[PDB]
Amino acid sequence: PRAAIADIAGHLPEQVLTNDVLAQLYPDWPAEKILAKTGIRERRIAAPRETAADLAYEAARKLFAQGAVGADQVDFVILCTQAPDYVLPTSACMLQHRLGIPTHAGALDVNLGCSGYVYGLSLAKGLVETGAARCVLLLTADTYSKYLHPLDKSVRTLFGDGASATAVIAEHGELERIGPFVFGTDGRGAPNLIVKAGLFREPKSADSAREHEDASGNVRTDEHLYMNGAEVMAFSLAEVPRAADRLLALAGEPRENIDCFVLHQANRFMLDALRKKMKIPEHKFPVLMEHCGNTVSSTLPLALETMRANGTLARGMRLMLLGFGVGYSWAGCLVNF
Amino acid sequence: PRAAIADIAGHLPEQVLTNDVLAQLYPDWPAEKILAKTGIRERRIAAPRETAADLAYEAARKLFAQGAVGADQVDFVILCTQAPDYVLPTSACMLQHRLGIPTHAGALDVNLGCSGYVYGLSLAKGLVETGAARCVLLLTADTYSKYLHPLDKSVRTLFGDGASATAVIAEHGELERIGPFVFGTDGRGAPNLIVKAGLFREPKSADSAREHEDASGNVRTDEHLYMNGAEVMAFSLAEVPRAADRLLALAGEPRENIDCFVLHQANRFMLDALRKKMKIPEHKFPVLMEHCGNTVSSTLPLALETMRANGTLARGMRLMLLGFGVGYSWAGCLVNF
Numbered sequence: 238p239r240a241a242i243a244d245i246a247g248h249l250p251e252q253v254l255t256n257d258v259l260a261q262l263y264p265d266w267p268a269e270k271i272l273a274k275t276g277i278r279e280r281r282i283a284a285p286r287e288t289a290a291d292l293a294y295e296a297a298r299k300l301f302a303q304g305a306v307g308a309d310q311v312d313f314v315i316l317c318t319q320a321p322d323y324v325l326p327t328s329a330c331m332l333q334h335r336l337g338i339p340t341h342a343g344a345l346d347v348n349l350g351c352s353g354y355v356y357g358l359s360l361a362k363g364l365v366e367t368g369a370a371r372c373v374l375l376l377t378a379d380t381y382s383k384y385l386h387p388l389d390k391s392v393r394t395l396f397g398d399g400a401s402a403t404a405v406i407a408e409h410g411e412l413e414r415i416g417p418f419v420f421g422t423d424g425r426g427a428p429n430l431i432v433k434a435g436l437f438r439e440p441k442s443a444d445s446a447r448e449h450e451d452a453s454g455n456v457r458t459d460e461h462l463y464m465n466g467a468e469v470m471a472f473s474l475a476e477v478p479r480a481a482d483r484l485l486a487l488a489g490e491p492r493e494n495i496d497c498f499v500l501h502q503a504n505r506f507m508l509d510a511l512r513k514k515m516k517i518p519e520h521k522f523p524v525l526m527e528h529c530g531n532t533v534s535s536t537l538p539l540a541l542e543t544m545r546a547n548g549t550l551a552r553g554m555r556l557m558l559l560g561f562g563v564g565y566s567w568a569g570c571l572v573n574f
Numbered sequence: 575p576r577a578a579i580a581d582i583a584g585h586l587p588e589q590v591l592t593n594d595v596l597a598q599l600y601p602d603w604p605a606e607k608i609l610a611k612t613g614i615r616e617r618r619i620a621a622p623r624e625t626a627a628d629l630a631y632e633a634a635r636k637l638f639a640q641g642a643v644g645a646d647q648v649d650f651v652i653l654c655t656q657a658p659d660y661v662l663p664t665s666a667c668m669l670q671h672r673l674g675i676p677t678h679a680g681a682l683d684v685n686l687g688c689s690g691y692v693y694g695l696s697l698a699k700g701l702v703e704t705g706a707a708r709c710v711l712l713l714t715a716d717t718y719s720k721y722l723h724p725l726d727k728s729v730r731t732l733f734g735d736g737a738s739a740t741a742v743i744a745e746h747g748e749l750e751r752i753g754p755f756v757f758g759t760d761g762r763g764a765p766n767l768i769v770k771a772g773l774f775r776e777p778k779s780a781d782s783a784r785e786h787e788d789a790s791g792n793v794r795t796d797e798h799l800y801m802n803g804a805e806v807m808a809f810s811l812a813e814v815p816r817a818a819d820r821l822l823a824l825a826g827e828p829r830e831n832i833d834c835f836v837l838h839q840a841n842r843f844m845l846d847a848l849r850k851k852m853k854i855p856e857h858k859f860p861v862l863m864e865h866c867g868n869t870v871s872s873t874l875p876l877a878l879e880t881m882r883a884n885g886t887l888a889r890g891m892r893l894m895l896l897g898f899g900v901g902y903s904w905a906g907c908l909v910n911f
Contacts, residue, residue, distance in 0.1 A: 363700020424671030
């Protein structure tokens with residue numbers, strides 16, 4: 238059997254965080270500046286008690302309603318998230334039950350961020366092509382909003398909450414529909430995108446709750462997200478084009494064969510810098526996060542969904558997907574959609 | 575390529591929690607009562623600031639020193655844990671760096687408990703047999719000690735801390751060395767084995783810190799582990815024998831062809847009840863947790879290591895591995911060791 242993407246469905250929460258509201262909160266960041274620096278106009282934010290798993294639930298329901306796959310067919314669930322319901326049990330286990338998926342289905346959570354979708358696809362392909370599953374439900378969901386400090390402008394302008402559901406199914410054919418892959422991990426990048434306090438390396442303390450204002454006027458605590466934007470950008474520029482070139486060389490694939498290079502939707506500034514370095518024309522390089530922002534592991538599937546909606550993605554297209562960020566972690570794959 | 579288990583190494587922390595020490599803490603539970611009910615005499619406990627990832631680090635170092643694989647050969651890291659360093663970044667990413675594994679290696683964390691090793695093997699096999707990786711480092715690590723209430727006798731008598739490292743490598747041959755698999759998930763079991771407060775479904779509060787004593791004299795809070803022993807036992811008796819039968823039916827093999835049935839090492843009472851229901855001879859049913867207790871995802875690989883040390887596991891033996899617990903989650907596979 239060969240693994241293929243059967244269908245994708247996204248879900249964004251109801252609350253909207255607009256540039257106008259952020260500009261009212263931050264005098265030094267007017268709406269025009271935010272848009273020029275990020276290309277993001279709006280982000281969606283989960284309700285106070287609404288979790289990433291709740292968003293994934295809605296994404297999966299939407300997927301089933303689209304009619305390519307149903308809950309009864311699902312025999313494995315992978316949830317990629319960095320904001321799970323509990324330390325334990327696994328959030329995917331509860332989703333199996335909530336979605337009415339049969340108890341013979343496998344289920345597990347994966348902790349990855351902006352590289353998560355491509356890694357997720359590698360796992361799903363593995364399960365399908367070894368006969369361990371015939372229909373893998375790959376879910377992505379994040380609520381970074383829950384650990385952004387209200388006065389950390391550097392991250393609140395960037396991140397949105399959201400989820401997706403992808404069905405990876407067994408297909409008959411003499412064509413690789415997902416793959417090959419390239420992978421990357423560099424744990425030296427851990428301090429550059431991190432929530433330091435709150436789990437087992439550093440339990441919450443008086444120290445971790447203390448607010449500190451940085452040289453850019455951003456306020457946070459060790460219990461909130463810290464992002465070194467300069468470092469993350471340097472990492473992305475260093476590793477992403479290299480990864481893309483590795484992947485093409487590995488596959489023996491002519492570069493001209495790629496119809497679309499779909500990258501993790503970090504922001505317009507990052508995406509433009511990558512596009513210029515990679516020498517890819519705009520029509521092969523989607524930038525589609527204006528109204529959702531950076532949704533972490535969900536950026537790629539949400540982009541693919543947006544592409545289908547705006548008529549730029551069709552069956553038979555040759556894609557390269559590239560995810561990169563927190564870890565540091567990155568991965569790329571080719572797709573025959 | 576075919577996926578095979580190249581080598582396994584375990585690691586237990588130094589601090590020993592004996593039945594005698596527990597008997598001093600719990601007057602109502604003398605050492606003989608603990609041993610009769612659990613079959614456990616000692617558990618190992620991580621140092622206060624020592625994390626599950628720290629234990630996995632030591633397991634991996636031990637594995638490399640055994641000489642079947644080295645850090646330079648590893649091209650994918652999977653860490654199965656329910657006590658990660660941070661909410662983000664992924665703990666496996668830091669382990670890649672700490673262990674001197676190349677940056678071209680993949681790395682991710684999986685959240686599963688007692689079923690984690692078998693699910694981990696399914697993922698590792700998938701990666702190897704689709705050519706995504708040639709040497710998967712599967713790590714298991716838990717520190718349940720960090721969320722047991724000091725006065726919750728039901729759990730402190732059971733759980734130990736520990737880690738393991740398994741190398742799953744590409745082999746040439748006309749034989750399935752790992753597989754096939756059966757899987758199970760039942761999220762209705764979530765409330766029966768759970769740390770309720772502390773993450774995103776229920777952030778810590780005044781209510782979550784409140785201590786309550788149950789009808790068996792056990793004290794806990796919602797920030798500590800809750801285990802409904804009767805429910806977990808009922809679940810295990812209902813699903814494990816059935817899973818084994820399904821697996822043998824899928825494989826088309828009689829139960830007599832299995833040399834060893836290696837089950838998650840929950841405790842002696844549970845293992846005895848399962849052995850009798852499944853009608854398996856004692857010599858094919860290892861009970862090896864007397865000195866380490868229930869180490870969660872590490873129970874199976876630690877058992878396998880113990881079997882190699884006592885000479886009851888050899889290459890060419892046909893094994894059934896069965897993992898079951900928190901989620902609810904379970905899985906079984908056959909192995910040609």
